[PDB]
Amino acid sequence: STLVDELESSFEACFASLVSQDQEEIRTGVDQCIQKFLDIARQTECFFLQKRLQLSVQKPEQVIKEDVSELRNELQRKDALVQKHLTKLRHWQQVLEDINVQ
Amino acid sequence: QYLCQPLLDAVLANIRSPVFNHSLYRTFVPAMTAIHGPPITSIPSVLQGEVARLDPKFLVNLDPSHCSNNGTVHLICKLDDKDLPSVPPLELSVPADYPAQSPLWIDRQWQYDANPFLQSVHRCMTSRLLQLPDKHSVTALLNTWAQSVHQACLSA
Amino acid sequence: SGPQAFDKNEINSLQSSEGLLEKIIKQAKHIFLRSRAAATIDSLASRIEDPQIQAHWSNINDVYESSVKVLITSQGYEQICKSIQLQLNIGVEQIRVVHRDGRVITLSYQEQELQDFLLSQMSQHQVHAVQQLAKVMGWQVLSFSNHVGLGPIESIGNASAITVASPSGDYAISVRNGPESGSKIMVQFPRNQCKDLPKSDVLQDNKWSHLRGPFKEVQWNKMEGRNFVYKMELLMSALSPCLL
Amino acid sequence: KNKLFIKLTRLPQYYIVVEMLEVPNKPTQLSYKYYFMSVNPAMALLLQQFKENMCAFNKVLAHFVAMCDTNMPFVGLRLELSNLEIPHQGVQVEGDGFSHAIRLLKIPPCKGITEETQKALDRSLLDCTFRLQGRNNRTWVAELVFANCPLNGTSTREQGPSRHVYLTYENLLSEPVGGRKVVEMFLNDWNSIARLYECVLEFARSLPDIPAHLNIFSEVRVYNYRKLILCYGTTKGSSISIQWNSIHQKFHISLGTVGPNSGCSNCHNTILHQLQEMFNKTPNVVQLLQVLFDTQAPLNAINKLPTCFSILPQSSTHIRLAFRNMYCIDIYCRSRGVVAIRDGAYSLFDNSKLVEGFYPAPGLKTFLNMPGLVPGLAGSYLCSPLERFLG
Amino acid sequence: VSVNLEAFSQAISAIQALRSSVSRVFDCLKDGMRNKETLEGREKAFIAHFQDNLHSVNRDLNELERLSNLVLYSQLLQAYKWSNKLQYHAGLASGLLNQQSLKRSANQLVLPPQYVDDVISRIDRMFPEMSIHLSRPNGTSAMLLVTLGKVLKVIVVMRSLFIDRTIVKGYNENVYTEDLDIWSKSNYQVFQKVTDHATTALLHYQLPQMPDVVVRSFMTWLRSYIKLFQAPCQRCGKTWRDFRTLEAFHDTCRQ
Amino acid sequence: DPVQRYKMLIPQLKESLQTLMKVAAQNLIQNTNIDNGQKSSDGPIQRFDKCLEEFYALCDQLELCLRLAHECLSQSCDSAKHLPYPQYLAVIKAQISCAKDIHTALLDCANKVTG
Amino acid sequence: NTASLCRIGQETVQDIVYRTMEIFQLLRNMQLGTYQDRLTKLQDNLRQLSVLFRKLRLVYDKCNENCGGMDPIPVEQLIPYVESEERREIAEVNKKLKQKNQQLKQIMDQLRNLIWDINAMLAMRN
């Protein structure tokens, strides 16, 4: 029921030992809470991946919009990088033109 | 040995006395129960598994044709694969107490003759049974049958 | 050296005795080798796009040596897919490869050797990607072989092999990638689920109808995602528990 | 005299011999013959030849080398399985083409386990497939698949009647991949699994008839066939774990706190040794749940005392408290929520003081908190809380 | 001292073991023999169990004798205990959770030379056997000469607070001490294999963001190369040191 | 003193075990002789129960001494681990109190966010 | 739309565990000025973590309430076994990025040649 609630409860339980009012006890406790949190996190990831697979196999247009946006962002990033490189190149060109003189 | 010996000697004295426990019981009941307190608050399964874990090429089944259900378990399985289905039965008699007396294949040369391919598969599979180690399993016979058929395919 | 008793060749031998021509030829050969390797990796980068390729040339070089840092990641999973990394040493006549698994290989100036080696390394990174993905999604690895010997005799590189099981038992996947014949994935459906397997009268109980059975193959073509890891993750989610 | 010796570094003593011969018709070609050699002043043992199945890769050579390196580790495991009278199927090609596996049919039943539990285990073991994995190809994994699980847990383990447990073994660098220690450890884990299946079967049989307080007080959480994690408490916070350590041949219990309401500890860590011995003498889990339910309430009060007061853990349900060293008091917990307190330093026999001595004078304070040291009892777990600070 | 604390903790368990073992001898005797399906079996079982119980009492008593030879205010102690508890708990939790990380992607250099110098000096402060000589012959890219005893002379080539190339050399060999011999070979095959293994360790120890723990682990792994020609292979007859386990190994044997 | 007491009780504990084993043997032999047909003297006998309680009493005294020494040693080592002395204890208690405030804040926030 | 909200839900659940790991590391590094910084960092981490809970919850509600008309096929019935103007825009962007990548490859080749030349000269000058 609302795996989000169960993962919240496990994240609370991982803190339920220190936040309260020898080594083996804390050892086994952290083992249990951490492994439970990891399992439920991997399960929520599996649910999200199933939803993605269904939406992609039945509605393959939003993925195309995502590819378009990603390609445009990549092009903008490349343009910005080449602009910065050109600025540095012009700076170093002026610096080298200053030297070499007598 | 040390510090315990007379107790040891005492109990080693008094084994095979019929009244024994009671004497122990008596002299050991009260103090303990005073101190610690009150007391406390058809077909064998191995063949079935071997069948369940076969390769889908084989379709093993029982044998109701010959005289069975008195001695060993007889099986006509099959050969179903991209290879060859020559003579699918290979009747195998798996005796009781499977982790011993490796099963024997009842030879049927009547069908494997009259054909060169079948004679070759018979020869090679027989030689491969000769080279098989002792106490072989059913899966071993099935695999060597398959590989012998494949050898006969690649030879001719 | 004579006072401190130097060795015959060690700290003596010729004690600088070469020619301008010899040194110049060595330098030219090194330059050509560097150029060759660069062009080869570039082509590999332009032609082969599925897994990845990366190269970070060192800052300081020499007249008879150079070095790069090759990395073969995935498109989306850069973090987890960091199992295969190379550090080439482009000498005057030999290219030395030091793999992350402690394997040193001395190649040749000829390009085909480098191209085939990089293809085999990509093929191995392909199965390492599936391994690292199964480690993260919590899928239990059943088997992993870096150089498998069962199957068709393969090309320049040896084939790889992995087999993982679903966290909830029944389902399981297997992957076999190679340089020549690769992407041979087949899912292991459970019994009593295909409904096409021939039943047997020897099986008289229903307990045996729960084992993973018919071994159905899946077409890697006409799939979703974009990278091998995307399709692997989508297939893993498809064989997950429906929490929708 | 023109041959190459390709030694296998992962599995030693195995040498491939690749000899080259001139072909008569073509003076510009060669023929390769591959032999499988083995060594034990090196002494060869046997020789066999495989003869069946850019141009500088020599595909068949690398193919044969990889095939040998992948197959030979299984031969030692097969020999070790045959040497210990363990019926096992030969090395078979798995359904997914490329693989090697050694599926066991029957295990040696057990030592020290009842016959009916041995039958219940042998009729539930479906498969014992062994497989090889890991870098350098020296890790083994056995996947046991049991059916008809006795009792489930709170986790998502209530699926179809097929529980899969994976047991991994990695031998040392020496003691080559095929050895005795791997199967020995496997048999040890199987023995521990059987000795734990004893208790799980007892608990599964006793589940229909429960005193109806432990049912709400305790709940089973996981069953991985090698550990039993029961959870008890009013809010299901505390947890006890059952496991059989084959090294010491005794049950090992581990206590923890997993729940968003509890103290600073499991509150039962002061009686851990007596509970260990109690479960070791009589392996029954319902008695454990009963004694835990009976002793948790007094322990929650006796744990909060200032640490002056010293807690000496005696036998179960007999926790001793001692103000300073001069004074003492015995805590006798019993069923139906009652604790009997005693004078302490007093002796249950001829009236002489113990080594600590210093007879506690008042005595009647325990009577108003409801010689003269016989029995002070009938505290209904509330006196056990107030009388702490009062005394 | 800590050794005394452990001896007392071991002794407390030994007293508990002696009391439990003595109770077991008497408690089992009270139950007495069980049927066992056979006359010989029942007699043997009772004798075996009693003898094991009697021996355990002797073993537990002996340990206690041997262990004798070896050995506004309360709130402050509560705070100390809670601090120790949180330290242990958070350490275990961080270990268990960073061992298994679910991060799959990142998308959802310039460094001060004095900072690199400070990091190198901090690393040189520990490992007193190793001595690192900082030098910048060519640009901001630093070159480190690391002397390990009379054993090794490693030449690390930093491009940034980043390890790029390493060439170990012998102690008797000449690094030329001046304008640094970055490009050369050791002329000994063992040191060449050590250079290969050092490049392998560099390719292995690669943390994404933090550039300090990588150099820390590289120096720690190099320090393991101090007992060469003095340590066994653990699977071989008498050059590699495994990561996360500083154990010697031959490259031909494995790892 | 705690180490010295542990030394003092160990010879006594060995003596108490010897008597408890010997008394048990004498009692079992007399009870077997009465239960079977075998004449035996009434004698002093010595009760097994008195010896078993004595052994338990010595065991508690030893455990109490060791538990105190272990607690005292653990406290001393921790005290060493953590100009005027009053200001010293003041800054120590201040650090502990601020750590406790951080504890309470993290606890209440992590418990109010969910559950 | 929904297929991107699902990726957002994926990245949120992939990041919450990393946030908890950072919180654990911060509590571990907290040994007894700097205390104020550690406290405000922990509080900011907790606030952003609760915000992540709220975000993952709302995206969960969204993907659950969406349930588009095209979902009659259960899982395992979708895997393929053995036995317009958007495409034009994609092709145009692909040609553009291909030309830009060829130009960037030329630039990188020139830069590599420059660096190799400078390194060789500054090495041989010695």
Q: DSSP assignment of E65-76, as one string?
A: HHHHHH---HHH
Integer Cα distance of B86 and B149 in angstroms: 8
Q: Which helix (H) or strand (E) element contains residue D4?
A: strand D3-7
Integer Cα distance of C235 and C229 in angstroms: 10
Integer Cα distance of E51 and E101 in angstroms: 52
Provide DSSP, chain B. Answer: -TTTHHHHHHHHHHTT-TTHHHHHHHHHHHHHHHHT-S------HHHHHHHHTS-TT----B--SSS-SSSSEEE-----SSS--SS----EEE-SSSSSS--EE---HHHHSSSHHHHHHHHHHHHHHHHSPSS--HHHHHHHHHHHHHHHHHH-
Residue C111 token pair: 């390009």
CB atoms within 10 A of CB G40: 10
Cβ distance D62 to C158 less than 8 Å, yes or no, reads yes
* Amino acid type, A51: K
From the candidates F20, F35, F40, which should be mutated to test the interface with B, based on the most B CB atoms within 10 A?
F35
Q: Helices D272-281 and D285-303 sit at what angle, rounded to 10 degrees?
A: 170
Specify the DSSP class assigned to residue G74.
P
Integer Cα distance of E252 and C172 in angstroms: 36
Min distance F64 CA to chain D CA atoms (Å): 6
Residues of F with CB under 8 A from a CB of A: 103, 106-107, 110-111, 113-115
Alpha-carbon distances of D199 from D114, D142, D206, D280, D286, rounded to whole Å: 12, 24, 10, 12, 10
Q: Mark D122-135 as b/e (b = at least 16 C-beta within 10 Å).
A: eebbbbbbbbbbbe
- F108's CB contacts (< 8 A; 6+ apart) are none
Integer Cα distance of C185 and C218 in angstroms: 6
Strands D139-146, D163-170: pairing kind: antiparallel
* Contact in structure between B97 and D105 (CB atoms under 8 Å): no
Integer Cα distance of D33 and D81 in angstroms: 33
Integer Cα distance of G22 and G41 in angstroms: 10
SS3 (DSSP) at D146: strand
Q: Mark C22-61 as b/e (b = at least 16 C-beta within 10 Å).
A: eeeebbeebbebbebbbebbeebeeeeeebbbebebbbbb
* Contact in structure between D167 and D225 (CB atoms under 8 Å): no
Token pair 């079996």 is found at E41
Integer Cα distance of G51 and G57 in angstroms: 10
Pairs across E and F, CB distance < 8 A: 68
Nearest by CB: A45 against C137, C234, C244: C137
Contacts of A61 in chain G (CB under 8 A): 86
* Contact in structure between E51 and F106 (CB atoms under 8 Å): no
Integer Cα distance of D30 and B4 in angstroms: 82
Min distance C6 CA to chain D CA atoms (Å): 39
Contacts of F3 in chain E (CB under 8 A): 71
Q: Mark G71-90 as b/e (b = at least 16 C-beta within 10 Å).
A: eeeebeeebeeeeeeeeeee
SS3 (DSSP) at D34: strand
Residue D113 token pair: 């386990």
* Contact in structure between D316 and D244 (CB atoms under 8 Å): no
Give how far the C-alpha of residue C122 lies from the chain's centroid of Cα atoms, to the nearest Å: 4
CA nearest to E187, candidates C8, C28, C89, C95: C8
Contacts of G104 in chain C (CB under 8 A): none
The angle at the Cα of D84, spanning D81 to D88, to the nearest 5 degrees, equals 35
Contacts of E206 in chain C (CB under 8 A): 82, 85
- B3's CB contacts (< 8 A; 6+ apart) are E58, E61, F14, F17, F18, F21
Integer Cα distance of D158 and D165 in angstroms: 15
Token pair 């009379």 is found at E150
Task: For chain G, say whether E104 makes contact (Cβ under 8 Å).
Answer: yes
Report CA dihedral (E28, E33, E38, E39) to the nearest 10 degrees: 130
Give how far the C-alpha of residue F81 lies from the chain's centroid of Cα atoms, to the nearest Å: 26
Cβ distance F66 to E11 less than 8 Å, yes or no, reads yes
> Residue D329 forms beta bridges with which residues?
D321
Residue C118 token pair: 């990089």
Specify the DSSP class assigned to residue D89.
P
From the candidates G1, G4, G6, which should be mutated to test the interface with A, based on the most A CB atoms within 10 A?
G6
Integer Cα distance of C215 and C189 in angstroms: 6
CB atoms within 10 A of CB E77: 15
Residue C21 token pair: 């021509």
End-to-end CA distance of chain D: 97
CA atoms within 13 A of residue B107's CA, in its CB half-sphere:
9
Report CA dihedral (C139, C145, C149, C153) to the nearest 10 degrees: 70
* Contact in structure between D345 and D327 (CB atoms under 8 Å): yes
Phi, psi of C98 (to 5 degrees): -120, 105
- A40's CB contacts (< 8 A; 6+ apart) are A3, A6, A7, A10
Give how far the C-alpha of residue A39 lies from the chain's centroid of Cα atoms, to the nearest Å: 19
Interface chains of chain C (3 or more CB pairs under 8 Å) = A, B, D, E, G
Token pair 């402050």 is found at E76
Touch between chain A and chain B: 3 or more Cβ pairs under 8 Å = no
Q: Taking CA atoms, what residue in E is nearest to G126? A: E179
Contacts of D126 in chain B (CB under 8 A): 49, 52
CA nearest to D317, candidates D343, D336, D335: D335
SS3 (DSSP) at F22: helix
Residue G31 token pair: 């040994």
Task: For chain B, say whether F60 makes contact (Cβ under 8 Å).
Answer: no
Integer Cα distance of B94 and D207 in angstroms: 41
What HEC string does chain A produce? CCHHHHHHHHHHHCCCCCCCCCHHHHHHHHHHHHHHHHHHHHHHHHHHHHHHHHHHHHCCCHHHHHHHHHHHHHHHHHHHHHHHHHHHHHHHHHHHHHCCCC
Alpha-carbon distances of A90 from A86, A87, A95, A98, C54, rounded to whole Å: 6, 5, 9, 12, 28
Pairs across C and D, CB distance < 8 A: 101
Nearest by CB: F31 against B27, B30, B32: B27
Sign of CA dihedral C21, C23, C29, C31: negative
Token pair 């951490």 is found at A34
Strands E152-160, E143-148: pairing kind: antiparallel
From the candidates F19, F70, F88, F91, which should be mutated to test the interface with E, based on the most E CB atoms within 10 A?
F70
Token pair 């408890």 is found at F20
Give how far the C-alpha of residue B137 lies from the chain's centroid of Cα atoms, to the nearest Å: 8
The angle at the Cα of A14, spanning A13 to A16, to the nearest 5 degrees, equals 50
Integer Cα distance of D141 and D127 in angstroms: 13
Residue E216 token pair: 């820390």
Residue D240 token pair: 């006890």
Q: Mark E110-142 as b/e (b = at least 16 C-beta within 10 Å).
A: eeeeeebeebbeebbeebeebebeeeeebeebb
* Contact in structure between B78 and B59 (CB atoms under 8 Å): yes
Token pair 């190793």 is found at E130
Integer Cα distance of C182 and B99 in angstroms: 41
Nearest by CB: A30 against E82, E96, E100: E96
Beta strands across the sheet bearing C104-106:
C70-71, C85-90, C95-99, C104-106
Integer Cα distance of D331 and D338 in angstroms: 10
Cβ distance E89 to A17 less than 8 Å, yes or no, reads yes
Nearest by CB: B22 against F18, F25, F35: F35
Task: For chain A, say whether E96 makes contact (Cβ under 8 Å).
Answer: yes
Phi, psi of D273 (to 5 degrees): -75, -45
Integer Cα distance of E173 and E157 in angstroms: 18
Alpha-carbon distances of G3 from D117, D373, E102, F95, rounded to whole Å: 53, 78, 21, 51
Integer Cα distance of C169 and D162 in angstroms: 8
Token pair 């445009």 is found at A72
Sign of CA dihedral E51, E53, E58, E63: positive
Contacts of B17 in chain F (CB under 8 A): 32, 35-36
Integer Cα distance of D33 and D52 in angstroms: 11
CB atoms within 10 A of CB E14: 23
* Amino acid type, C186: M
Min distance D249 CA to chain B CA atoms (Å): 23
Give how far the C-alpha of residue G98 lies from the chain's centroid of Cα atoms, to the nearest Å: 23
Min distance F70 CA to chain A CA atoms (Å): 14
Cβ distance E83 to G32 less than 8 Å, yes or no, reads yes
- Residue D187, exposed/middle/buried by CB under 10 A (0-12, 13-18, 19+)? middle
Contacts of E26 in chain F (CB under 8 A): 24, 52
Cβ distance E203 to C59 less than 8 Å, yes or no, reads no
Strands D139-146, C161-166: pairing kind: unpaired
Token pair 């154990």 is found at E247
CA nearest to E213, candidates E88, E143, E95, E119: E119
Cβ distance F95 to G32 less than 8 Å, yes or no, reads yes
CA nearest to C134, candidates C243, C237, C244, C49: C237
* Contact in structure between C190 and C171 (CB atoms under 8 Å): yes
Pairs across A and C, CB distance < 8 A: 48
Min distance D327 CA to chain F CA atoms (Å): 12
Touch between chain D and chain G: 3 or more Cβ pairs under 8 Å = no
- Experimental approach: cryo-EM
Resolution (A): 4.1
Cβ distance D257 to A25 less than 8 Å, yes or no, reads yes
Task: For chain B, say whether C197 makes contact (Cβ under 8 Å).
Answer: yes
* Contact in structure between E53 and D277 (CB atoms under 8 Å): no
Integer Cα distance of D380 and D339 in angstroms: 7
Nearest by CB: E80 against F10, F63, F82: F82
Provide DSSP, D188-208. Answer: HHHHHHHHHHHHHHHHHHHSS
The overall longest dimension of chain E from CA atoms, in Å, is 92
Q: Taking CA atoms, what residue in B is nearest to E26? A: B28
Residue E190 token pair: 């063992």
Residue F57 token pair: 């009493």
Residue E146 token pair: 């690391």
Token pair 């990891």 is found at A38
CA nearest to D288, candidates D343, D207, D218: D218
Cβ distance E102 to A31 less than 8 Å, yes or no, reads no
Phi, psi of A30 (to 5 degrees): -65, -35
Integer Cα distance of D341 and D321 in angstroms: 10
Residue G49 token pair: 């973590």
Beta strands across the sheet bearing D102-104:
D102-104, D125-133, D139-146, D163-170
Residues 32-91, chain E, touching F (beta carbon < 8 A): 57, 61, 64-65, 68, 71-72, 75-77, 79-80, 82-84, 86
Integer Cα distance of F24 and B14 in angstroms: 14
Min distance A4 CA to chain G CA atoms (Å): 7
* Contact in structure between E194 and E223 (CB atoms under 8 Å): no
Helices (H) and strands (E) in chain G, counts: 3, 0
Q: What is the CA radius of gyration of chain E?
A: 30
Cβ distance F114 to G53 less than 8 Å, yes or no, reads yes
Token pair 């529980």 is found at D163
* Contact in structure between D292 and D323 (CB atoms under 8 Å): no
Cβ distance A5 to F114 less than 8 Å, yes or no, reads yes
CA nearest to C175, candidates C154, C157, C195, C161: C161
SS3 (DSSP) at D92: strand
Task: For chain F, say whether E11 makes contact (Cβ under 8 Å).
Answer: yes
* Amino acid type, D250: K
* Contact in structure between B131 and B115 (CB atoms under 8 Å): no
Strands D320-323, D309-312: pairing kind: antiparallel
Residue C101 token pair: 């698994």
Q: What is the CA radius of gyration of chain D?
A: 32
Task: For chain B, say whether C198 makes contact (Cβ under 8 Å).
Answer: yes
- Residue B4, exposed/middle/buried by CB under 10 A (0-12, 13-18, 19+)? buried
Q: Taking CA atoms, what residue in D is nearest to B38? A: D334
H helices within chain D, ranges in order?
59-83, 115-122, 180-206, 214-217, 272-281, 285-303, 364-368, 383-390
Nearest by CB: B40 against D92, D282, D332: D282
Provide DSSP, chain C. Answer: -TTTT--STTTTTTSS---HHHHHHHHHHHHHHHHHHHHHHHHHHHH--SS--B----SS--SS--B--EE---SS-TTT----EEEEEE-SS-EEEEETTS-EEE--SSHHHHHHHHHHHHHHHHHHHHHHHHHHTTPEEEEEESS--SSS--SSS---EEEEEETTEEEEEEE---SSS----EE-PBTTTSS-SPP-TT---SGGGGSB-S-EEB-SSS-SSSSHHHHHHHHHHHTS----
Integer Cα distance of C102 and G101 in angstroms: 35
SS3 (DSSP) at D339: strand
Integer Cα distance of E223 and D29 in angstroms: 52
Contacts of B28 in chain E (CB under 8 A): 26, 29-30
Nearest by CB: E255 against C86, C102, C136: C102
Specify the DSSP class assigned to residue D257.
E
Residue C117 token pair: 């080696």
